[PDB]
Design a binder for these strands. Structure first.
Ligand SMILES: [Mg+2]
Ligand SMILES: [Mg+2]
Lengths: 77, 77
DNA sequence: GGTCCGACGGACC
DNA sequence: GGTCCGTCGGACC
């Protein structure tokens, strides 16, 4: 019903917004860097929480023909 | 003796040099983008060949505190 | 000394 | 009409 850590989900949604503000695609690596830089969470954990949040439906995973990216439901474009 | 496709290894080593020339860390995502942009190889294949080349010893994988990167043995530093 | 972060103009579809 | 590529100064350790 909600597997992801709710606060970690919040940190990731913050990272997505920041990475987009930096005019970059919000891919796995760039989200990990942003969450690390803002909150000190380790990359391995951010990747698990990104996966879990996608299953919860609180973060959208978009399949691009190149690199996949992730979106806030509140700003799905 | 060699599990990777030798030509794909060569394309990945060119990508590592190009990514470093752009003053970025040669991580998985950035190597995939560079190989895709230069030779049209799909992300899934670049990742497998990167893993195989690391096994062959023709590409070095470096453990970083944050995001791991990849190096040409010819410029290891 | 050496690596690559971060901002941003503008190419791309 | 919108996304993010690609450059590069300079912050970081
Ligand atoms: Mg100096
Ligand atoms: Mg326009």
């Amino acid at each position: 019903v909600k597997l992801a850590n709710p606060l970690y989900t919040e940190w990731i949604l913050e990272a997505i917004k920041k990475v987009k503000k930096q005019k970059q695609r919000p891919s796995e690596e760039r989200i990990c860097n942003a969450v690390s830089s803002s909150h000190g969470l380790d990359r391995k954990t951010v990747l698990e929480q990104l996966e879990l949040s996608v299953k919860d439906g609180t973060i959208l995973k978009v399949s691009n023909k190149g690199l996949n990216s992730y979106k806030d439901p509140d700003n799905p474009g």
